[PDB]
Amino acid sequence: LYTRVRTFSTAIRNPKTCQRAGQETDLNLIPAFIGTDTGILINSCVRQPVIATGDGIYALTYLTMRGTCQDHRHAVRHFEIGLVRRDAWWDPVLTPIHHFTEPGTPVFDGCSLTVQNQTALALCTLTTDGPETDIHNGASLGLALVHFNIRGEFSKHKVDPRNIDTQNQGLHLVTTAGKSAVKKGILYSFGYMVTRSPEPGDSKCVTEECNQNNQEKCNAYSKTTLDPDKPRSMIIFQIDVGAEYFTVDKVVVVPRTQYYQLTSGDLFYTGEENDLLYQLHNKGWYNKPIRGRVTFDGQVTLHEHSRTYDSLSNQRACNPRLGCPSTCELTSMASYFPLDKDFKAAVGVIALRNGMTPIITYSTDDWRNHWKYIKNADLEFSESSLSCYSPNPPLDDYVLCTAVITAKVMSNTNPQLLATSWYQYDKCH
Amino acid sequence: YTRVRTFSTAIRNPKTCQRAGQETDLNLIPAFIGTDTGILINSCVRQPVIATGDGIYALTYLTMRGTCQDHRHAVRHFEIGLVRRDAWWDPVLTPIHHFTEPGTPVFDGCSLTVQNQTALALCTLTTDGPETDIHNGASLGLALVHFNIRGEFSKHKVDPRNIDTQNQGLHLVTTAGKSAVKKGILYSFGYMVTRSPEPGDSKCVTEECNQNNQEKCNAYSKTTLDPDKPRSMIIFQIDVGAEYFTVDKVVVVPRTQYYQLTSGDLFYTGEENDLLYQLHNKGWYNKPIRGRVTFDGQVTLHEHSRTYDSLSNQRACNPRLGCPSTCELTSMASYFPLDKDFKAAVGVIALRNGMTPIITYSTDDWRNHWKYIKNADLEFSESSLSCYSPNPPLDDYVLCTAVITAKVMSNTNPQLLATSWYQYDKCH
Ligand SMILES: *[C@@H]1O[C@H](CO)[C@@H](O)[C@H](O)[C@H]1NC(C)=O
């Protein structure tokens, strides 16, 4: 059988109160030989990467298309599960053991991903041309729960979205790509919901001096409508995947007061009795990290942390500048992962400047301890997913992180899948 | 498992019609196989071998951090998967199970073939690589590796004491390439360190090179390790399920049959047909080296007269490539038979300067056409190529998949890339 290398998420740990030191030496990057070839030679497009780790196990998912990024009809959904194994340097590295593909059509879109014990769980949307195009065309959408385990078993189960409690407001339910979390047998994941009535209230905005009515621009570009007749709200799905008592599958609205533009995100497990953490993905005009704590009692609140030490940018400036509400959209996102259950310390993968040059950033509160290169080159990347994990028993000064990015390799106009891991400094003083 | 049934193009009768060059552009399709191999960290991938069976493929390769000369810390990868219809209804390769064996010792020089639902690899167990181990006075092991589409994996040490060498073998080494199974016997290339030097001249050329070619051919033939260690090319014969009693053995490929000691591929053509072969261009000889293998009376490599493809380096050699020298091609060529005679062939080769991977398509000694894998200044080092027909076959095409080790984004080491294509196969 396989020997297990025990690991756990850094996000379940108590925060360190000591000053976290910047690492003086350069990064020890180590192999993450996961995923597949994704068509660097033929300029294929990889979208929606999500990585998740458990106890000696990781899982990975992504969507591939030939030639363009706008061909959902002929896309292929990839799923993968693998192990943490000691290599010839005795480093714990990720390596795949089973891979699965599901070609369209319909295709699995916007899959979330988590690892529970020996099983990966993905909640996905069944679509022909992509959810927004299907909804516009008057088509319906499906949902699916996919699981696969380290034995190589694979299951896909349709979930009737009409039987999910939406307080009779939901017309369409859509999952979006990112990390999910399971607490007390309930699977939580981000998505959005087309509703009968528009959601009242102002979208979250900024008081930055932008030579305009910010709140007006914020509402206008909030992406809370798919059409004059199609309002949509951000949601968190709650699916019973093993609750102690019977629970009704439901969605809960994330009110538009809680975010700037409707977007995807990650939910980070911190323990059975601890609040989930979150990050929203910078895919619009807001160019600072969007992360913090989620609570549900009475209503869904995104308790957003005050974070300014990292800034996202595009190669070409926007008018008004990024950070000001506009129709500009960041071409390159950032992934953050909590080093503790409060998100006090964070690891990030982000572009250095101009939407290129992947770097790792390392913060405590609103202070950047250091940054290091993944690759000091003019390499653009579009999407990312990041997971950090500690061996058990832990190392004194380090944890481990793995990132997947979709990068425009060798002057390709589309992005392909690349991966890397590193020893992540975790040390006091 | 649900899969597109396939068979190797090398078992077919040669087409009696004239083969046309393809006027239309190449239809390249995804080969999303293997893993990330450290493009971001300049890892080194070596010894790639791909093999196909009936709706099944297998892949193997060796990875190292930072340099290509770190056998002590290398990792051997094995992979098996299926031929499946994608959303365009094209038959594409997709992995189902992956395996790694980190050093040390590591599996070096693995050959690879697919027998029914099981991949077979014959490998050499080594610490610092076979030549370094031999130089250091260490011994080597052999191993037979099996892994199947259900995900089962087996490795068994093979004691060289059970391999008949007519009491001449001192070390046995497998080299990376395609193997073949006929009538339950596994055949694969390798080399053998012997007690006594092999007599005879190395195969040579008569090209005017302003030198004594035969003397240079013998001197640069790589038939000696160190100063006192002669070695001979061999073909292993290992029982993997023969119906009759056989002794596992090596058979010498005499030095008259090849230019420099090197690795190669053996191509199955049917239970009752001669194997085909190719030797890998890793030295000064810069034309294809391929043809038919026979065994009745020790190994004869019946080398075809092939000149339509020529390999080149970015920096010229003095004397020029094609002339015996100590210069070595930085990029190899992979060929695959489209029939049991190797009459028609698919090739993967660099266009010029050891870069720009292209596909060539030949009949006899004529290049019908060539097509780009990538029209870019992309250096690549090693390759493996397999072509296969869906069953029932297509009228005008077959399918091919290649893996190459390419120096991506100004990396000094090469990483694993893959692609497939519809290969023109049409008459007139
Ligand atoms: C973890 O998974 C294994 C295999 O699926 C199962 O047998 C075991 O009971 C699980 N343990 C828990 C605590 O759920």
Author numbering:
A (entry chain A): 203 to 631
B (entry chain B): 204 to 631
List sentences from the manuscript.
For structural studies, minimal constructs bearing the C-terminal six-bladed β-propeller head domain of NarV-RBP (Glu184−Pro657, termed “NarV-RBPβ”) and MosV-RBP (Glu202−Thr632, termed “MosV-RBPβ”) tagged with a C-terminal hexahistidine tag were generated. As a result, the MosV-RBPβ structure was solved utilizing the single isomorphous replacement with anomalous scattering (SIRAS) method with a platinum derivative, K2PtCl6. Indeed, while the HN-type RBP dimers typically assemble with a 60° angle of association between protomers, with ~1,790 Å2 of buried surface, the MosV-RBP and NarV-RBP protomers are organized approximately ~90° relative to each other. Fc-MosV-RBPβ bound to all cell types, and to a lesser extent Fc-NarV-RBPβ bound to Vero and LA-4 cells. Additionally, CHO-pgsA745 cells may also display cell-surface receptor(s) targeted by MosV virus only. In particular, we note that recognition would likely be sterically precluded by the extended β5L01 loop of MosV-RBPβ and NarV-RBPβ, which is not present in the HNV-G RBPs. Second, MosV-RBPβ and NarV-RBPβ maintain low levels of sequence identity with MeV-H RBP at SLAMF1 (12% and 9% sequence identity, respectively) and nectin-4 (7% and 10% sequence identity, respectively) binding sites, and further, lack the β4–β5 groove integral to morbilliviral receptor interactions.
Here, we study the RBP presented on the surface of rodent-borne paramyxoviruses Mossman and Nariva (MosV and NarV, respectively), viruses that constitute founding members of the recently defined Narmovirus genus within the Paramyxoviridae family. Each protomer of the RBP consists of an N-terminal intraviral (IV) region, transmembrane (TM) domain, an α-helical stalk, and a C-terminal six-bladed β-propeller head domain, which mediates the interaction with the cognate host-cell receptor. Crystallographic analysis of the C-terminal head region of the dimeric MosV and NarV RBPs demonstrates that while these glycoproteins retain the canonical six-bladed β-propeller fold found in other paramyxoviral RBPs, they lack the structural motifs associated with established paramyxovirus host-cell receptor entry pathways. Additionally, using an integrated crystallographic and small-angle X-ray scattering analysis, we confirm that MosV-RBP and NarV-RBP form homodimeric arrangements that are distinct from those adopted by other paramyxovirus RBPs.
